[PDB]
Amino acid sequence: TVSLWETVQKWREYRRQCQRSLTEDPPPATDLFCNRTFDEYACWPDGEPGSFVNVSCPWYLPWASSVPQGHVYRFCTAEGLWLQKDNSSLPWRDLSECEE
């Protein structure tokens, strides 16, 4: 079985690689773009205003081999803020394609 410790190791490397992208990817065409971010789960690129942003299921998941073409989603609003969940400050995401 896929152990906690190996998943944590993979997660750390995912985060490492993401942080490198956050620092090294060129700035977005406009400040109207939604901003790149690591949310502890996935690495998000900058987003075009009024569009959906997609990223692959994080490869550190124990079941990543079962969801090889799955994607997780955010929505970048026309004001360059990531779409938020009501009440909260938290961003809307759809992770359903990456469930076990």
């Binding site: 079985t1 896929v2 152990s3 906690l4 190996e6 998943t7 944590v8 997660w11 502890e40 789960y41 998941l61 124990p62 992770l95 076990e100």
Partner: peptide, 26 residues
């Protein structure tokens, strides 16, 4: 049927899966 090895495997797998859930929900 279900064996003692199944339950111990399930428990270990669950450790990783809870970590994933801590990542997500938060």
């Amino acid at each position: 049927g279900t064996f003692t090895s199944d339950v111990s495997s399930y428990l270990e797998g669950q450790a990783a899966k809870e970590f994933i859930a801590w990542l997500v929900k938060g």
